[model samples]
Structures are given as C-alpha cells and as structure tokens.
Target: SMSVKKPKRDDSKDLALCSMILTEMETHEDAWPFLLPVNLKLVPGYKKVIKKPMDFSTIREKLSSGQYPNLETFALDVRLVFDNCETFNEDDSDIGRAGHNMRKYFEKKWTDTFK
Candidate 1:
C-alpha cells in the first residue's frame, strides 16, 4: 500500500517566512530579545552579553529607548533557525535572500558577545 496525501512541503513558503523574520529585524528591531534561563544564567561566560532579562515592558522600553540587546544572541538564534530550515536556495529563493539580509545586519553593527 502506498498513499501520500499532503501538500508538498512549501519550502519556498518556509523560506518566505524566514525572509519575513529578517525583515522584521530591520523594521521591528524588537524582533528578538533573549533571556538566559534563571538557572543557566548564573553561569559565568554568558553573563556578560545577556545582560538584563527581558519582559514585555522591558522590551518595549528598550524599543523606545533605541537600544537593543545582544546581537550575538540574536545571531546565534538566527543561525539556529537557518540551520533548521535546511533550505539552501541562496541564489533565488527567499532563504538565500534572508541569509544575505541577516549577514548584512551583522556586518555594519557591533555584535555583542554571547555564547
């Protein structure tokens, strides 16, 4: 017996969503605010960059103040998302475009240290 009845995975759409995520990073800078778990937070190395745990209001305030949290944290998370996507259409697909945009974001800015 052989039966397959699901819409083919629209990696293009998934890649499109990735594009949207990067777009938000530029227009909506509050796109990623990280908080180390309270337990892991007490560890030594990650402490330097992951300063100030984030809540809705703290994020809101930071947005208003025009000072964002760690970009290295943001980049790490971005890398994770990109790795999970497994869509490598760097020439034509949104995946490639978004990858380019993400790299672009990191290029000009000062990347905060993170684990």
Candidate 2:
C-alpha cells in the first residue's frame, strides 16, 4: 500500500504550549482587566457594543474543556480579550493600557516559545 496524504497534526504539544501561555498571562501584572468577563451592570452598554466578549477565565475554561483544536484557535481567543478592550476603552485609560501591555507580553512570549 502507498500513502498519498499526510496525517493530521497531533495537537498535544500545541495544547501544552497554549496552556503554558495562558497560565503566564493569568499571572501577568496587567492581567487584571482580562481576568474576568466585563460586568454588564458596572459597564452599561457593554453587551450592546461588544458582541463577543472574551476573558482569561473563559479561556481557561475553554482550554480545559479542549475547545481549542490548535494553537491558532487558542491565540484567537486570547487576542479577542485585547480586541474587545481596545474597542470599549481608550488607549490612555487604565483598562486600555493594561490590554496593550498584556498583548505585548503575550506576543513576546508566543514568539519566544514558538517562533
């Protein structure tokens, strides 16, 4: 028999790498804003403006649940947290600054780990 196609890539390594990145992000100093979902009561119109909200806790749950099939999907959710932050908060604001810092940290770690 002759094989003509490559088999699907194993995601075990990717899962482990993503989990490690998530853990580091959760402990980052700027992780406060992305730690949990935005409180709708506290931030009125949050639900209206941000159609899809993402956070560290939710990502952790998803990661643990095996919702992410690969590193790309995992990275997408992580970026969503920062994207939502930028959309709702100003660059100079506390939350915005934290988001930027967190993104920078994540990107750096991602590159160092993967690239």
Candidate 3:
C-alpha cells in the first residue's frame, strides 16, 4: 500500500479559464503597439541589404553577432501572408498578436520541458 499526491493538470478548460483570469500580454506596451523598422533612420549600419542568392551560412553568421542586425531589406523572410493569417488590415495588430503568442509559447517552454 502506498500513498502519493500529485498536482492536478490544467486542461483546455483550465486554459480558457486562465485566459479569462489573467491579463493579456496583448495590452503590454512592448507588445501591444507593434513597431516595424517602420521609422526612417539616417544612422549607419542600421539598415543592411544583403545580396540575393546568398547562403543561409552567410545570413546566420551575421545574426549570431551580439550587435543588432536589421533585416528590413531582406525579402526572403518577408512574403505575402494571405487570407486567414492576415488578421490586421491597416494597423499593426496582427504582428503584435503573433509576437505575443510566440512570447507566451517561449514563456511556457522555458518554464516546462515542452513535454
């Protein structure tokens, strides 16, 4: 005979309830108002344009640096996101939403083992 106590799990229902109970990250300043490289900057080394037909190794090396690297002119990562995923029309809402969602994922993954 053995006795043990384990914490109960939070199912999808718990997620729904948690969503209601917790304040949304969508409201945070760093997240809510999504700013693109939208502003104009006269600063040097800020906006870099890599050549087309470049390899991923070249790209990865540049990004691995601690210094900030802007991919504003990189068209590869930028594409036409059609229909359903385009949740925003004129504002930056969709971007904020996506970023916040990713942030939530990272937060959870860091806390748990993604098990």
Candidate 4:
C-alpha cells in the first residue's frame, strides 16, 4: 500500500481574515444605486463574460475547519478567480480588480503570511 502526506492548512487567524475580506465583496441588485457590480448583462451563449460570485461561505468554513491548503495556494486560488471572472458592466465592472484589492487587504491584515 502507498501512503501520502497531506499538506498543512491555514491557521484560525488566517481563516478568519479570509472570511472578513469575503464579507466585503458582496453586491446587491447587480450595480444598483451603490454602483456595485451587476449581472444579467453578459452574453447569453456559453462562456459568457459574466461570472458568478466566489463561494466564500464554503471556503471560509473549510478554512475554519483546517481543511484548506497553504497560503500560497489560497492566494493563487483567489487570484485565478479575479483573473478569469469579470463584472457585468465591462466598462466599470472589475471583479478581478477587487480580487487584487482583497489580496492587498489580506496581506495588510495578515502580515505574518509575508514572513
């Protein structure tokens, strides 16, 4: 039989930070009076420009439960989400930008990860 070693996971502090930033990424009515990101404006065909919101709840839960991967993996996962997904209004919408912003926010709050 072959045995495999699983990689370590994020700490409670890091997990808590992830959830905090995620909480700030919410949108209502898709670009409403707040000028936030909206949906239902992308192409109707497959592979449309519009992208779904990240599954923060599940991710946060996983992180809290110590089932998440390393910080690098988590950062990359978030970067991909921002790189691939975009807001409904291509002009002003910038989900990827916000993802990057969140990255900074995470780093700002969790400087320990930088070490």
Candidate 5:
C-alpha cells in the first residue's frame, strides 16, 4: 500500500522553452514554418498582435533538419510521458503543465516499458 512513483517534468521548462522560441521570432522572421504547433498554438479565435506561427518547422521537417520540437507538441509529448498527469501544483498554476509532464512520463515509461 505505497504511493505510486511518477515521472518528473518541469512546466517552467516548457514556458522557458516557449519563451525562447518567441524570442527567436522577435530576432528574426518566419517562425512557424508549417504543420502548426500542437500546444499553445493558434487558439483559432484570439485578437492580438504578432498573431502567426513562425520560426518553426513541422515535426517531420524539424526531425529532418535536426531541431527539437518546442512548446505545443513538446507539451503533448510530455503529457504522454507522465501517463496524462493532470493534477494541480502547489502554486495553483500549470494545468497544462501537469498534462505536459504526464506526456513525458508516459512517453518515457512506455518507450522503455519493454526494456
């Protein structure tokens, strides 16, 4: 009757990674290359400036180009890793953050489950 151990992931890291992507956008042009970001992507209906995917290539393309996917899809991947961990944190933030980790946790677990 012991608590289950879960995979560990950092949402702040997700935010940090996303911010870096945005920063790169500011420094250059044409960020979102194609296929669209999965997480934190164009929400379909939001009024704001700088509203467009840029500085990013599709997952398949990025893999071909040798770059790690960022934000959105990354978070999704993380969620799978954590077995869909969707619990609130002590700071009362990161609903998606919890989901993000679950992706990582689940992914790592499932990926190595056979090993």
Candidate 6:
C-alpha cells in the first residue's frame, strides 16, 4: 500500500485564465499605449527614468512561452506595464489616464476571476 498526496494541477487553468484576460486587455480601448514597448527614439530619456519597461505584447509572448511559473508571476508582469507607464507619464496626461484605466480593468477582472 502507498500513500501519497499529489499537488493540484492548476497550471493549465492558470494558462487559460491568463490568456482570456490578456485577450480582453488587448482589445480594450485604452490598450494602445500598453500594446507595445516604449519607443526610445520617439520618447527620449524614457530609459533614464523607467528602468524596467514592460508591455502587453511582451507579456503575451511570456505567457505563450510558458515563461511564467504561475498566475502570480503573470500578474506581476501585467502590473509592471501599468506601473512603468505611470512612472514615465504625468498623471493627467493621455497615456497616464490610459494606463490607469487599464490597471483598473485588469484588477477588476483579476479579482472577479481569481478572488
């Protein structure tokens, strides 16, 4: 007789949930600013301020490639995108507002889905 406790296999569920969230975020009206990485040429001095830049496209790739070990990791990267945006742009600016909206949407979805 053998007695062993197996861990719940939730990776697939996490993957699916993250994918759905990413799709919804990608289609959001305020997603344009976060869709891709910031362009240093067009926005000079960006790198000087925002040390770790993040974007939705990069998060998408990371999710698809299985780079994230779990949902928390994926969520961290997603939040980083908005955090970087806030750091680089003024609170009342267009891009800043967009980032705030996107972050709110993401947090709502995250709570509704996971919590």
Global CA lDDT of candidate 2, please?
0.90
In model 3, how large is the Cα lDDT of residue 51? Answer: 22
Q: What's the lDDT for all of these models?
A: 0.40, 0.90, 0.33, 0.47, 0.37, 0.92
lDDT tens digits, residue span 70-98, model 4: 66555554443444444432434465445
TM-score of each: 0.28, 0.89, 0.23, 0.41, 0.24, 0.89
- What is the alpha-carbon RMSD of candidate 6 to the true structure? 3.2
Query: Where does candidate 3 stray beyond 4 Å?
Result: 1-92
Candidate 5, overall lDDT? Answer: 0.37
lDDT value, residue 9 of candidate 4: 56
How much lDDT does candidate 1 score? 0.40
Q: What lDDT score is found at residue 106 in candidate 4?
A: 48
Model 5, stretches more than 4 Å misplaced? 1-5, 31-70, 73-115
- Evaluate model 5: give its TM-score: 0.24
Q: lDDT of model 2 at residue 107?
A: 96
Model 4 accuracy (lDDT, Cα) = 0.47
lDDT of 5 by residue, 1-115 (tens): 2787677555445444444433443233222222244344454332232243232234334433435454456434323322322321232445345445333443454344322
Candidate topping lDDT: 6
Please provide, for model 1 over 4-50, each residue's C-alpha lDDT reduced to its tens digit, 9 standing for 90 to 100.
Answer: 57776433343333334444454534323222132335555434534
The weakest ten consecutive residues by lDDT in model 6 span 1-10
Q: Estimate the lDDT of model 6.
A: 0.92
What is the lDDT, from 0 to 100, of the residue 81 in candidate 6? 94
Tens-digit lDDT string for candidate 2 (1-115): 3777778766558878888999999998889989988898888989999999999999999999989877888888999999999999999999889999999999999899888
List of clashing residue pairs for candidate 2: none
lDDT of 6 by residue, 1-115 (tens): 2677687665668799999999999999999999998897788899788888899999999999989998999999999999998888899999999999999999999999888
Clashes of each: 0, 0, 0, 1, 24, 0
